[PDB]
Structures are given as structure tokens and as C-alpha cells.
Amino acid sequence: HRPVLVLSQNTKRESGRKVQSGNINAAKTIADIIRTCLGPKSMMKMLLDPMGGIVMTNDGNAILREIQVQHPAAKSMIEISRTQDEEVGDGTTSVIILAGEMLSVAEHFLEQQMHPTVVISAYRKALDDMISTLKKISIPVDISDSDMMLNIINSSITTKAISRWSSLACNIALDAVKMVQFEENGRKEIDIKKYARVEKIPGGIIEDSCVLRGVMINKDVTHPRMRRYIKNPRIVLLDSSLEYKKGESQTDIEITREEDFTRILQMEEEYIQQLCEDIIQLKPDVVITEKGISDLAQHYLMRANITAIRRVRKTDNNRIARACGARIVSRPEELREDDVGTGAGLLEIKKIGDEYFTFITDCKDPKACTILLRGASKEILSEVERNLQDAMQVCRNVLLDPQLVPGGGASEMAVAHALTEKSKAMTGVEQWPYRAVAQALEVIPRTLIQNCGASTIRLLTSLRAKHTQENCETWGVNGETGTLVDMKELGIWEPLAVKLQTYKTAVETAVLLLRIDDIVSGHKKK
Amino acid sequence: AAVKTLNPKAEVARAQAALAVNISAARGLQDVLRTNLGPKGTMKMLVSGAGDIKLTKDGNVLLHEMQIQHPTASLIAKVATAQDDITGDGTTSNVLIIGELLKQADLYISEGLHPRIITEGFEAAKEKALQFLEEVKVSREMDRETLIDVARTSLRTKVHAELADVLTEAVVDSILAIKKQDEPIDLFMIEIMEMKHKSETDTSLIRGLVLDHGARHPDMKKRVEDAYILTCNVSLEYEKTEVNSGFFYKSAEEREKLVKAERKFIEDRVKKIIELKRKVCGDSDKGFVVINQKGIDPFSLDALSKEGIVALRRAKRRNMERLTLACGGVALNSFDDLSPDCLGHAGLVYEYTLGEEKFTFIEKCNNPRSVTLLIKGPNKHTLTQIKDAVRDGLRAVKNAIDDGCVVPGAGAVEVAMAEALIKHKPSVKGRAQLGVQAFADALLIIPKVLAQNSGFDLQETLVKIQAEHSESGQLVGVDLNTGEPMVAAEVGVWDNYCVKKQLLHSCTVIATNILLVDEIMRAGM
Amino acid sequence: AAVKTLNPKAEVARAQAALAVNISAARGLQDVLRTNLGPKGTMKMLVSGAGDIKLTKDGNVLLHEMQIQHPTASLIAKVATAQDDITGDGTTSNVLIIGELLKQADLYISEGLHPRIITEGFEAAKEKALQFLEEVKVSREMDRETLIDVARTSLRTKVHAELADVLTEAVVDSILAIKKQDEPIDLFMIEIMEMKHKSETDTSLIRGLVLDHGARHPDMKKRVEDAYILTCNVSLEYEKTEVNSGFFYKSAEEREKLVKAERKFIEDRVKKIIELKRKVCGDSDKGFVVINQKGIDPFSLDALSKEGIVALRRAKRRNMERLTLACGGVALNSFDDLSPDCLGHAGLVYEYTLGEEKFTFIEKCNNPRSVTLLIKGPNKHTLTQIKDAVRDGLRAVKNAIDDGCVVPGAGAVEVAMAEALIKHKPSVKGRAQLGVQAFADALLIIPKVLAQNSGFDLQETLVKIQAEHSESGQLVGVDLNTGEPMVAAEVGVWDNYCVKKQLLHSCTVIATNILLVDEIMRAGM
Ligand SMILES: Nc1ncnc2c1ncn2[C@@H]1O[C@H](COP(=O)(O)OP(=O)(O)O)[C@@H](O)[C@H]1O
């Protein structure tokens, strides 16, 4: 068999209008998947994963993470929603619909024999004017006010499934961020992924779920003689083990006499008594380590009335170090009085459904908390956990940038009239793709009325006429009823960092996918 | 479809399609589990791939061991798992409410209406049903004759009422001798042992403990009276050093001096035990029993047999907590502070062998606060009937003690709750008028199923029950013998308050979420 | 099952299993066919295995050309076949009653009751529904303006109301000039020809006949005025004897004598035709047209062309029945009694070629009693839209002439019939009280589907329609433009009496038989 002399074996080549108009249809397809998951009248979407679980959610990020596509331009839109989920909390879905619409109007100009670099240069001029328009229609927020911050987080959870328990989820998500607001040196940081642990337990009701003033772990006591109820403990956190293990050497003992073997087994007992005597000089109450505790170490802590927890995780030890104010030491003979976590409140080993849980709550000033979620099953508790992650990150953006944009369609139409009046001074070939950016922003109030069943012709004509005058300019779409209510009366306000990241990611996605005119698939790597 | 464009091997369901998937699967689990609700239900024989018989009719064991591969059937199985984890009973009635909340809502969504409007009426009906449950609960100050009638209801729905009279005296009397003075009752203090001795109707309540292992030496005493329990966690067997050392000897006579030296640290632990038997005035019988969680080498078992000390080995983790309360001693991890204060006491310690399987019994304790229900079922599947009924009955009497109020029985709660929603149905003042009607008809399946499983008419029984409730003020219910409306608070049929509270909360949220699902799809391959 | 023991390859369905098969399949045909009831319905594009487009939305063409393999769907398709066979319209509304007679009955049979109790309520409800239908019919003495509104109702529900103004003048004026003096109108006298000339909105009514074949000789006249129709059934082409004979000749001069003699019997038939043209005073134009059902050889076509006689060939079987009434002659089978009494008359006989396919037109008759609807649709699939709507409209006006009364329109019959069963619901005095309720709610799907296809609300429309009927005496109905209750007898929306009578009889018997089926099985292999 003589082989055929070819070049670039087993690959494909595609260019021309089949790739420029081919990436638009791949982006319009993902925009139709999550189109019914934007407004407050959205519905859940049950997903199936190859691990065997079930994901029933309506958030735009959790839907696209379970979709495996084969198109290369469709893989780019999934990474856009992952970028919006890591920057802000409730800024993902809105980007995929907006990037699908800015590419929808970009496909019209590609049929008009216009170069893609001309539409992108008109998109960058429109991107720089959408940022300047949102800063003019913003409003400063008093972050010290408690009731003002409850209205911001309620605007982000009205879309999600926790809108029924709005009086509870707003107080949990606000108090979780204000506890983890830590500042040691001259830098303010909010860590809601390492310190704001969301522990869910199947059982009970959702109304009994509350944010604890402290941490909790699913660990029982090491010995039943140890106390399960301490009022004011002195928690000492350890990192090393309390056992006798093999050293990091080639140690080998030559036993010649009879008394040598019994001496080694006694020196192993005396070594445990040496480190157990070093940790009781500070008179603790709770000893918590990350490694194993031998039975000889439990014997000295039993008669000293010390409650010992055995195998707490490394991520849970860093969280309890901020709640109780302790320092994680890795040496029992180098313990100091500043390494003891005083100020911890009631410690109780409760049981929730045939399983013990160590509760360290009622702290004086904790820097880390644990949201205790209780529900019907593990299916809906993963929904409230994903919704509280989108409810705590939208409170983090206000504490870092206290500016609010009128959402619910009022934000998208206030800039759509600003780009229309600014396009009259263009007088060039980039004027017509500049006008299509303002028409592409209108798809966000278009989706709020298509989900509630309102009219799309009779409402868009009246809403576009409201933004002609410069007086009110904050009229949006009421997703609950279906009429036009001003956003100063409803209370729907979105933060600036959510609206800025939505517009900056939707334009630059259209910048990337419009410069693609060729696709080569079929090559291997190392 | 859009999902078929990007991923061609990804099936999908649309808005009117995914609703018919979840509703038809909810009726599939409803029609199976409705034939075993109550005392007049039918037994189910569950055979796995190995060939073992699992004869039971509990709603949690039925949904787990069933050959079903459906996403909607897996959602109800997750809610049914948490029902049998925190409160025991209420699992079979949990699935029938979900199966009726989607069937009664199917008659309105298909007739033009939107699924979200039905969910607005479910929340307005759940708030009134939760306030009505707090008015019909009866507080009886946790009397021991009240706990008999609570345990009799949960045990009769899992056995043929001949063992229910036996297991009631084994569940109520076991839950009272654990904790007093308004203390939370730990269910880990009750051990569940499976025997095969006599018959299924011979399950007694051992006031002490029953261990599944016996003495590992033939010269030890089989029956020990007035014994001292020494609970140990030390290792009496030969253990090597952590640093690998190895012996080095020159002559053959020096080799035997090292075997005597390597057991000297082991024999020092045995000398601490045999001196404790002499320091308790050993001029009498003075039996000694060591449970000894860690294993014992046969060199130390031969040493303890010559002194008259019964020594067990390889116990459980929770045996150092149940026997510590029962004997009254101190579970020690070392022999550095041995004293007679850490010793236990039991009037009778004896063993019994059932086919090369010894069982050590510890009985005759003063205040044990830890007991053992000794199930003696003849078959393997009959052991699973009593074990699934004991843990159902123990969690039933635990909720009647922690909560101070007892909820009425079969039809005295669900019929009165549905009639309370009709008078508050024009109070919603909007489009959610039909949502309260769908929630009220879904709660009436509990008198409908119990009248159907008893062989009576379904519609003729519900007319006479609602007539006796509306023409009076008494919470009347269903009778499983005659079909006449009988009050449940007077005939001795009770239920738990937390079961009916969680049935109104777990079934409502899982119904408002399923009705708002329209994109059932399978992607990720 | 017992069928699994005898035949291991035989599937079966039990009592509660076969009921769920027939009901869920009836909902499958209901949810598909409800999107085309009325003028606001949507068009369905039906593609077969070849690739041809069948764009229609009639209920009989939808059920036949649908890739479904189900025993329940085959039962409803046979009842839907006879609805489009004897009375035309009433096929989409036929399936929606069966889809609701099994869905409203499932709410009672699954709730404890027996299926035979529901079928006893259907017969008692059919007796009141048949008596109420005779009280709402309106006799209007078959006025020609009444038949326009009857034909307009059946034609709008199959076209986009621009051709309904054209086809109503082609259906009503065709059905009037067929039979008089209380004679049953034969629908075989109307020819339906498919053309492609101008457009879909150009279908005219030819007062005579349109033949699909033209002249088979180039010397014949293409346009003939004041013609004489000679309808023949003889075979002018060369035929042999029945007995196999052959020829025998000696010389070559006797060979040509046999070819001249073998055509003597053929030319004797042609000489009877050309002598009839000379006996009708042929000193004028005096055109002659021979339709001639059997074939003609080109020897006789050349002989008739020299005299000036247009001769067609290969006509249909019913062309000797329609042209005989239109021309007024006698369809002869021989030329032994030729006379001017058997000749016809037409003022204009002309032909036209459409892509090498001639079409002979015969017009200008005195009293034809036979017409031809000339459908000139542009596409091939558009011809199937008009032909299936003409026969739907011709059978609608044929029933309105034969029956002496007209039945009102959309909601003026079904809403008033359902309200009559509520006041007669306690008249049964037994267990069949819920059977009349299931029959009354099943008749309300006709205002529910028409309010759903028009875009209005389903439950909000049925409240206002039943309010105007209970507070007045006028038979109010559904308006597909505003949603307000409007009377159907005043706006010009009528229906047939035999359609609504068979909808109460064919749907009720097929629902009482399906509900009494519990052993669906497949055996015979
Ligand atoms: N009550 C309301 N009225 C009008 N619009 C609302 C209301 N509640 C939420 N919305 C709109 O619904 C949208 C939901 O966006 P979302 O999908 O949460 O973004 P992300 O995916 O980034 O979290 C918001 O942009 C907001 O304008």
C-alpha cells in the first residue's frame, strides 16, 4: 500500500462567510438557552451530570457549566459566564444575552461588505461611552445604613429561588459579609470563600436556617469522658500530631541488653507526656488539631478535663482561627498566651440527624462565620447555597464601590438614548455600527417582558419615549406586574461593579469572535 | 431545539414537555407507595441482584431499593431520605403529598393557567396550614401511657399487630430510662442486636448491654455473678516499636532473655489488672470482666484465665460510651492511675453461643441509662422488619418527648386542615384562588388512601368524615375497621408534631420547584 | 400474567395499566390537533418519506398522515375517517371530545370509582344532549343567503380568509344548480380540476365541464362556438375479433385489398358520424365535438378532421354522466339509432395548453345541472389546500339543504348544552351523578380551544360566556377577535345539524367502549 502524498493530514479548513456568520449562530444558540432565566419570573432548569447528580437551578452560570459543546466559538461564551461569576455575584446571565445580541446586530453589517475591524473600532468607541454614562446616572450609597443594604441584596435575590424567603436571606447574606470584613494591616479585604463557609444539613425547615456567630464542623469528641458543653473555653489550635511517628531519617536501634527494649516503649510514652504537659501550662479547655491523637494523649487530656477534637480539616482550622482569635501553632513546646483563642462563646456538641456537629458559636468579635442551611433535601440546599454565593458577592461590591445603577431595564435604556444622541456627531462610516450598540442594549428590557407575558410592542414604544426627556430617566420594566414603574419607587437597584463588568465583557466577547475568519481543527499537541 | 444544535447527543424537554415528565413520574411513585400506608397496607418483597429477601413496606426502604432510573424519581428519593433521618416516620405519607400536589395542579396548568400562579397559592395555603397545626396540637405532659399510644401507631404500620404489643413495651420502656431532668435523649445509647434464638415474637429489653463477641479462652468463666467491669482502651497484645529496631543477640541462651524482655512491657500491664482484683477484697467470688476494645494476645489471655478474670477483645467504638454509663465506671486509656473508683458493677454477666457465635450479656444494673433491644428474629428478612420498626418507633417516642405537644391521628389532622383552607380561600384576593384549592385537595389523600387500603370506598368515606367534622368541633378521622368517622384523640391514635410540620414544609418547596422546571436535559458528554 | 405463560413473546396490559395507555394516548392526539380548530388555527406541514409537502390542517388528513404506531390512535382515526366521509366537517372537534371524555373520566375512576359507573352517566347525558339539540336548531327554509354563511364558516377554518370570499361564491352557486324539487344532491356531478394558471385566489365556477384532455390531431379546431356534443361509448380504434382468426392472402395485390377491407367496419362507424353532421343543416359554422370515452385510432382522427369535427378520446367513467346532463343529449353505446335528439349543445368549446397538457372547456349551457370548480393554485401543495376545503364546503352546504334546520355556530351550542346538563344532573338519582358532570365538562372544550388558539385566556373567557347565557336566553358564543361573548346566530356563524348530532353519538360510544377496556395485549405469533 503506497500512501498518498498529502499535507496537514486529518485536519479541516474553513474560511470566508461560513466562519464569520458561523460564530454568530453559535453565540445565538447559547443566548436562547438561558433566555428564560433572566427576569424575576424565571423558571428552574433541571440538568443531568455524568457523575449521577441532578442540578436544578436557574442561575446562568450553573447552567452553562454543565453543558459540553463541540463548537469552538461556543466554548468561548461559557468562559465568559465563568469570568462574570468570579468577578461579581449576579453578573453572568445578562452578559450572555447581551453578547448574543451585540453579535446579532454585527452579523447584519458583515453582509453589507463591511470589514470586521470597522465594527470593532465602533464597538470600542461605544464601550468607552457606556462606562461614562453609568457613572453619571449613579447614586452614592450610605454603607453604614442597615436598611439601605437590605434593599440592594433584595434586588439580587428577587430573580433567584430565595425570593420567597426574602426577609431571611437578606439578613443572613448581609451579616455574613460584615463579620468576615477583616483588616489587619492597612488593606481592607473581604474573603467570603475561605471564611464564609456555607454548611448545608438535610432536614428541618428553611425558616430555621440562620448565620451562626462562629464556625461549625461535623466532628464528634475523641473520648466520651470529655465534656460536650463548655461555657467559656480556651481553644488552643494545633497543627502537628500528638502521637509518636517515624522521623524523617534512617533511625535504627541495635538492642543488645534486656532493659533496652522496655526503655524504648517507655520513652514513647514519656514523649507524649512531655508535649501534653506543655499544652496544659496555659490551662486550655478545647484542643483542636489537624492530625491524629493517640490514646496516651487522650489519657492526659481526660484527667485534665480537656475536650479534644481529632481530625479537623486544614480549611476549617484557618476559619476557626479568625472566629476565636487563636493562632495555629505546630509545636506544643512553643505555645504562648497569645496563641490561645479566648473570647469564644458557648461550645456544644449537638446532634442533627444521627450525626454529631461541633458548634463553636456566640463569639465576642468573630472574623469568620458559618451559614447553617437546613432544607428538605440536598437538591434545594445546593440551590440556596449557590444563591447565597450570589447574595454575598453583591454585598461585597457595595462595600468596595458604593454606587448603584437603576436596574430592571432602566440602566440599559438610559445609555441607549445617550449613544443615540452622541451618534449624531459622527458623520462617518462608523456611525451605523455605533447605532446598533444602542439597539443591542434594548434586549435586556425585551427579556423582562417576554418572561412575564407582557407585550413587546406596546411597552417598548412607551419606554423609549420616557427616556427622550432628561428629567426622570430612571424608568425601567417592572417584572412582577408587567407595566412601567419608576425604579425610585420599586427599589430595584444594581451595583456599579455588576453593571460595569456586564458591559465590559459583552463588548470584548464581540471583539474576539468577530476577528475570527479561519478555524483549523484536527491537530494534536504534546 | 437549541441544545440539539451544539450537542447532538443531548436530549432535551421543552416547557409543555418537561412538565409531563415530572407529573407522570410522580404518579408512578404514588401508585406504588399508596398500597402500604397505614396498618392495612400490603407488604413488599424486595429482591436485589444477589438474591437476598428484603421484606419491608417503609417508604424510605422502598424508594432506595427500587429499580428506577428517572430524574424526577431521584428528587423525591432525596426528600424521602431526610425524612427518615431526623424524625423516622412520615416517609410514605411524604411521597403521596408530592404526587397529589402535581396531579391537582395538572388540572389548572393544562387549562390555560401558568405554573407560577399555582405556586403563589401554595405558599398562601402553607402559611394557613402551619398556623392551623399549632392550634390542633394536644399537650399531655409526656405521660408514659401517652407514649404507649404514640409508639403503638408507628409500630402497627410496620408489623401485623401481634409484635406491636410486644415492641411497644420494648420501645417506651427503653426511651424513659436514658435521660431525665429535661435532657436531650441520645439514640446512640440504645444498641440493636440481631439474634436467632426463639422467634420473632420474643424481642425483650435487656436493661444492660449485649455484646456480639464472647470470651476467647476456653478456661474462662461462662457465668459470672456480681462482677466488676473494667473498661479499657489499652493494647494488651504484642505491639512493636515505632522505630524499627530488631534484636541482636550473641548466644542461644541470650535469645530467650530477649523474648522474656520483649514481653515484660506487656506483662506489666497484666500485673496492673491482676493486682486490682486483689485490692477489692478478693476473699469472695469477686468476678472481673474486661471488655478491652483493643485486641489481646493469647499469652495474656492465658495469664488472666489463671487468675479468674474474663477478658474480651475487639469491641466497638461506642461500646466505651454505652457500657461506661451502664456500669458506672471510667473508660481508661492507660494503667497509670488504676483505682477501684473506675470499676463498674453488674449483678449477672453470662454468655450464650448460637452456632459458633458467642454473645456476652451484661444485666442487673441499678441505673444503667443505656439499654439494648434484643431482636431474636428467626429469618434474615424478619430481622430487617423489626430493626426498621424499632428505629421507626424509637424516633417516634423521641419526638413526643422533645416536643411537648402531640398531634392527632390518621384523619383528624388532614381533614380539618383542608376545611380550614376553604374558608380562607377567598382571603387571598387575586389569581391564586385555585392554588389554595389544589393544596386542600392534595392534603385529603391521607383519608383517601387509608380508606382504599382498608377495602372501603374512597368517595363515600370522605363525605361522611367531612360531614361529622363540619357539624361538630371534634377532630374526627378514619377508622380502619368499620369505615365510620371516629375521633382519633379518644381511640388512642396519635402522631408526631414535627412529622406533620415537616410534611407541610418539605412537600411544599419541592412542589413549587418542580412545577417551575421546563428544560429537563442531559448534557456533559 | 396469564398471557406471558402461554406465549412468551406476547405483551399485555392489566386493568389499571390498559386504562393509562388509552387515556395518555388520547391526550397525545388532543394536544396536537387542538392547534388547528377554527379560523385562528395554524397550518401543519406534513412531509412523507418521498419529500412532498402536504400543507393542511384538517383533522382527517392530520391523523392519517402522521407517523404514529399506537392501538388507541388507530381507534380514533377510524371514527375520524367516517366523519370526513359522510358529512365533511366535524373531524377536529371529533377528536377533542374523545380527548376530554377520557380525561374528565380519569378524575373519577382513579379516585376509587369503577369505569362502568361513568359510562352509565354518559348515556343519560346523551339523552338530554340529543333532546336539547333539537330545541336549538333554526329552520330558515334553505335561503341562498343562509347557505353563504354556512359555507363561509366551513371555509374560513381552512384558508386565510382571502380565498374564503372567493370559494364561497364557487361552492354555494355550484350546489344550487344541480337538483331541484326536493331531490338528493349528488356530489359526483361537480368536477374538481387542478390547474396552475394564475394564482390561488382565481378559482372560478365553470357552468359546464372542464375536461383534462384535448384534441389529438393538429388539424382540428381549437376554439369552437355553437357546438353539438355527441357523447359516444364506441371504440373507433382498430379492434380484432374475439376468436383468433388472422388473414390469408395469395398475391400482393390481394394484400392491399385486405387492409382496405379490415378498416371497413371501422370506417362504417365514422361514416355514421359525418352523415349526422350533414343532417343538422351544415350550411353554417355548426361545430361538432365528440368526447368519445373509448380510444380512437389516428386513421379515424384524420377522417374526422377533414370534415371539421373535433374528436377527443379516453374520457372518464363519470364524464358520460356529467356531460349528458350538461349537454342534454343521450350517451350512446352504438351507432344504429343516431338522431339529432341525442345531440347536445354548447355555446363555446375551446381548449388551452398548460405545459404540453391541453384542457378542454365546455361552457354556455342552458340548464346544465353539472358544474366544475376550476382550481388554479400556483403550487402543488396549494392545490391540496383548496381541494380539501372545497369538499369540506360542498358537504357542508349539502347537509344544510337536505336537513331542514341549521344549528348555530362556535359556542352557541356547546355552552348551552353543558348548562342544560347541570340542571338535569340530579335527575339520574343514583351513582351516575358524576357521569353527567364529566360529559358536560367535556363539551366545554370547544369554547376552550377556540379561546386558546385566538390568544385569549381560557378560564376568563368561559366565565363571561356562561354568565351571558345564564342571565339571558340568547345562545351566546365565542368571538375570536375581541374575546367578548357574541351571539353566533346574528353574526353569521352557523353549523350543520348532522355534524353536532354525530359528535354526540360517535364520540360517546367510542368513549364508553375505551373506558371498558382493561386487557390490551398483542398475540398471534
Ligand atoms: N423586581 C424586578 N423588576 C424588574 N427587573 C428585575 C427585578 N428583579 C430583577 N430584575 C432584573 O433581572 C435581571 C437578573 O440578572 P441576573 O441573571 O441575576 O444577572 P447575573 O447572571 O449577572 O446574576 C437583572 O438585570 C435585573 O435588572
Ligand SMILES: Nc1ncnc2c1ncn2[C@@H]1O[C@H](COP(=O)(O)OP(=O)(O)O)[C@@H](O)[C@H]1O
Ligand atoms: N391504628 C391506626 N388507625 C388509623 N390510622 C393509623 C393507625 N396507625 C397509623 N395510621 C395512619 O397511617 C399513616 C402512615 O403511618 P406510617 O406508615 O407509620 O408512616 P409513613 O406512612 O409516613 O411511613 C399515618 O398518617 C397515620 O395517620
Ligand SMILES: Nc1ncnc2c1ncn2[C@@H]1O[C@H](COP(=O)(O)OP(=O)(O)O)[C@@H](O)[C@H]1O
Ligand atoms: N368565523 C367563526 N367564528 C367563530 N367560530 C368559528 C368560525 N368558523 C368556525 N368556527 C368554529 O370552529 C370549529 C371547527 O371548525 P372546522 O375546523 O371547520 O371543523 P373541524 O374542527 O371539525 O374540522 C367549529 O365548531 C366552529 O364553531
